[PDB]
Amino acid sequence: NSTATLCLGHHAVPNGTIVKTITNDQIEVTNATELVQSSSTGGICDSPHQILDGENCTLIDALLGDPQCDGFQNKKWDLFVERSKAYSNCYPYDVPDYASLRSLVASSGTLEFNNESFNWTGVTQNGTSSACKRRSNNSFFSRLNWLTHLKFKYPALNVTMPNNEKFDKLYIWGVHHPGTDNDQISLYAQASGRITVSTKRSQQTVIPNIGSRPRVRDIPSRISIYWTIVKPGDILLINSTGNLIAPRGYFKIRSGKSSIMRSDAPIGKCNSECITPNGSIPNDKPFQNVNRITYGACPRYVKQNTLKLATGMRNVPEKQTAIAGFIENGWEGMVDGWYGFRHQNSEGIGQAADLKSTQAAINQINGKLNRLIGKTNEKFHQIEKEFSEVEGRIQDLEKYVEDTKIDLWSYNAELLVALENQHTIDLTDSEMNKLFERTKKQLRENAEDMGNGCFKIYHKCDNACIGSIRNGTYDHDVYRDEALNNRFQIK
Amino acid sequence: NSTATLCLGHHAVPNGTIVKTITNDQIEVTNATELVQSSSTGGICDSPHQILDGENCTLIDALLGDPQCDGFQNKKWDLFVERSKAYSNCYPYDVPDYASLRSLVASSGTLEFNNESFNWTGVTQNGTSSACKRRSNNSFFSRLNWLTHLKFKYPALNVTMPNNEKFDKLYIWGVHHPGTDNDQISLYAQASGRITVSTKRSQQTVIPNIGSRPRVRDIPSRISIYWTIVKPGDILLINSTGNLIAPRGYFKIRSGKSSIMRSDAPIGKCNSECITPNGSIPNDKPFQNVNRITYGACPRYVKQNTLKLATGMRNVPEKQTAIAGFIENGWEGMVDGWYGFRHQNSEGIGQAADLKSTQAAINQINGKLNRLIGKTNEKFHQIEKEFSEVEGRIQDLEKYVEDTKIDLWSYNAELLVALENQHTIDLTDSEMNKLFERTKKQLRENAEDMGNGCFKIYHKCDNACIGSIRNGTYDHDVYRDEALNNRFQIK
């Protein structure tokens, strides 16, 4: 009657979410946000990276100049996309260390080609084949020059091309392995012999090996492809007596952020920074479980399919009914703040949100969101992470490196979220405790702690009086005489 | 006389253990558990993984079919164990990229072999040697076919074997390098010439090189071993004019969780999930310092030989003697709880454990144990981590990858244990503080804090009264008049 009650409390919601902390495997909080990206739209967005869709062509087919790849001449990319349907449709070939040539062209990001005038005096140039049709005519790789005898002579070639440019030159060349001794003589006028391609700093010698291989598009012969990089001030020398598939010039070789990806995802007219083989993915979240193959500003790949970051305090049911405070009890009816006051006095029972404490909690949570959301880092050309052939040692190491990396990031992600969630529970608990302590200090000897998050105020404390406490302007001296008389009375 | 004392406290033990936290390099707690496995039984348990003990045979010798390895035909394994005593006892051979063939067969996990009928018309089959005895008779590798001239002719071989199966085929074949020109002619009727083994997608040409090597089991010649994998719908073509050591068929090549390990540990009849070269190790702990080479569900390798996880609160000696509470003081005599009450009243001096607070602490500690104990993850075929030969670049990278991984896990382990131990000290301190605070709130104006973890209760508080406080049913109003009179009296 001659007293009032003031309770300190916090909000609660009817639909909380479970998160993990250091203390609890499962604790319900008022709200959380997902930190693992697990979906893609399923398309690769054509912006803001320059995409080159290989369609039916591998990068190596586009490099050599398979007729169906003619439209790729001189093009550049940030990301070359190779399709599973891609197929070769020219003379059958192989590339010793195919993976390396693919990688180095991919990383260079350009098919720019400059023709050069080699001196092929004494031989027939521009050999063609029915296995490599261009506009329904017998043809050959656009960037290569099939040399054969002239008037049944093939004089020894000893041909030079200096690099007088200020940039490196990439030369692609080949050796023809004929199916039979008959074809060797028919083509090069004499028995097969080695090809030597050299510079001041390197030498490569290749021996043609005559023999039938299983027919590919009806051809039992093969071309083996080689490459040579020539520095400024160095000189290419080509030395051969037959079987040379000659370069027509050089590719520019650049450095930058280009790569290549295997994917069947359609290319869309849209804008997304992070590309995976499954399609582009949003990069707001710090982690993702879509694909360990990525290009661009991407979330880091982890094994988890979900990691929930708490964005609110512990969610605690309201106890069924006298008003009561935060001790084992949240307030579902408090909707305009996270913390606040309930009172009972001469004028009724009321509630008010505390703005300061609410904002302190929200600001800290927004702070950690700002550290974690929209802060992905870019990666470009990396290592391959899926393999179509069995290879042993090198592949074992590539796979182990990647597995090692993923487990370490998955661990970091698990620990980070547990630590942050513990900190969020701690900081939100702390704001409640601080509010209660501040109030206790204001009240001095005029109130007692009832043990339920409420004070029994031992004087008449009307709406303005309660407001003075909430506003931090309550003068304990004004009421102390009244309060002491009420507290320390014999009953 | 007209008062009582109620002290809040916690247990202590005479034999505490030192752990590390974020705050302290060394702090004594009541109990701890070891998180680094540092011993092995010294034997490899034959369950639950399928173990194949190579005995005197390497995997490659068992593959080729060295007579002493005949018992291995067609066997499978999860883990092939190669012994240091193993030795070859057939024709001397080498394998270019031995490590890769070993790895790929190891990972495949099967020696299943299917014979095929190759057409070797025109040559003598089944050549043998005194260097490869089988049942005291001259013999040869079981899976290989040594072809030699027939009637002093060796017609050119051009032999095909299509893969019309729905699975890949692994072919193992070889080239014989004779010791002398005499042996070349004696065996193959003509001067040495290249061997070409091809498919639609690959080609391998090998040149026999005649010459003496140092004698091995009295043989100066050598066989070099090669392999070819043939896909469904592809075709093996073998083309040769001498020196061919032919396949008799193909190996199945499978994918799964198989590997190979070098170890001299005996195989025992027992059951253990984690295998190391030192023997099987228990996998209850999250870390281990036994060996960085592992197979199965294993603790992670770290450099530390011990990491102790606190499983109890700070251990604090009892001060020598009036009762006293937890302030700089533990209770060795409290044995039925971790926290509790001591009192002095009209009826004597008593102690009671507080079950709730004790269980809260124990449950949280059991929670972190459940996260850390018995939760190891499986790894299977990885990379090699010990090397018998000097190799340079590739080996440097294999070693660096592993060193990198171990240092990162060792760091994670060190930080994890420090963080968890800090949290355990914090949570156990917290339960003590909470118990004291709850009691303070119950007592209201009827008691004062004596500063030593005890309350001076300013009314007669008999055994039932004390029990009411411990049980949370104490009604402060019943005693308030008495208590206020005693507290606020002029003396």
Place this chain on the structure above:
Amino acid sequence: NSTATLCLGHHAVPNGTIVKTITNDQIEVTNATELVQSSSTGGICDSPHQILDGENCTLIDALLGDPQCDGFQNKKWDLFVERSKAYSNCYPYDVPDYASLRSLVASSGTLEFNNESFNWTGVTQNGTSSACKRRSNNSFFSRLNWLTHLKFKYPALNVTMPNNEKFDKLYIWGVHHPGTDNDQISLYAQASGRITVSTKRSQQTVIPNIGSRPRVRDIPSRISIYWTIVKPGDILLINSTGNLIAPRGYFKIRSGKSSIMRSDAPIGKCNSECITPNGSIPNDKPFQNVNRITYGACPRYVKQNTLKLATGMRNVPEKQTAIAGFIENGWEGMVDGWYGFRHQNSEGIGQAADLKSTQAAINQINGKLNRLIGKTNEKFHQIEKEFSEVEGRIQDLEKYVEDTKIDLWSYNAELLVALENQHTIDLTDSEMNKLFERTKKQLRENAEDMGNGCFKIYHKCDNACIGSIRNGTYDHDVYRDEALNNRFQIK
């Protein structure tokens, strides 16, 4: 008048430093220390590691014995330093897998060479060239022996060298590729043919390839360099009919902590444990941003250029003026302690530092400094991390491994510093709170909390009385009657 005031507080400084914690991106503390080393002196200190400055010689040139490298014979190193100005000045050569031979010699750490007496009966030894002058005379690599015909005969060589030592032998040898058929005959009396160098466990066959390469120091021919390691109990066999560049003996091959580094930094007479290409760096700090290439006891490379570790409490401005305590308020005038007391009584206004709380904070901060400062770990030979040529697959993997490692350490560093800084703020806040709580408990019913970190003491409390509180010897009973009368009076 009949009362006193006692305030609890902590120091503040006029020049605080901003650090990052888990709670705050930016919080000012009284002091911090830098954990990332970002400068070098710019010189490589010649102590305590044994440094070998290659000057104009690569390690491989010093190994082969280019005349300008004669002074390097038989020398050892912990770190061989290769200079960008280095150049070859003998016969032009290449080394297939140059990187591996460089690495394995580097890691071995010795050029110790033992001559052996090979039986080269039937040929001319010690061939020389004007391209390799020694003391103005035609010469050749010191460790190699250029064999040519004798009286226009080159008999087949078949030469043996057993390893009867208890250590491994490293043999370096070569093949001469002549510029023309004329030179082949002039030098070796017959058409070129293979060289085979073998042991019981290995074989290497190399084919000389006649032809012009672009002239290097006027020479169109080349030597290709090979190596063979021979175990105890094994035997080297060299078999050749021309073009052999023979070994004169063997190199010791050792194991230990040696490496090689590319750097143009001058060598100084000074002592530093950590070497980078930029020069030696101090190793007090746990991290560094100078270079990811390191040798010795070095801080770990991270991407951050600064990480500041808090070494003091939150720095909080003093509020402008009655004395006041720590609530939103630090004391710039407290200079002999971190925490303490201010009082107002009958005898004036005074301040005293609290030694215990100050020392508790300082000891804990010194503890974490001792864990982090001067505790670097040693690494020696690793992998290469900069590349002068484009190579593809292997280089992609080397770069990815290193990028992976650096990002993981950079993450660990960021989290470590945030966690430690949070802990430092927490522990320093805690000492303040504990001091306030201890004081509150001493005062019992004789004082009230004014809400600003101060107590109103309700009795006359002169300088000695205040001292008794600070010293922990205050007897509340002495003053309780006076204090209760003053507190609970009607006004």
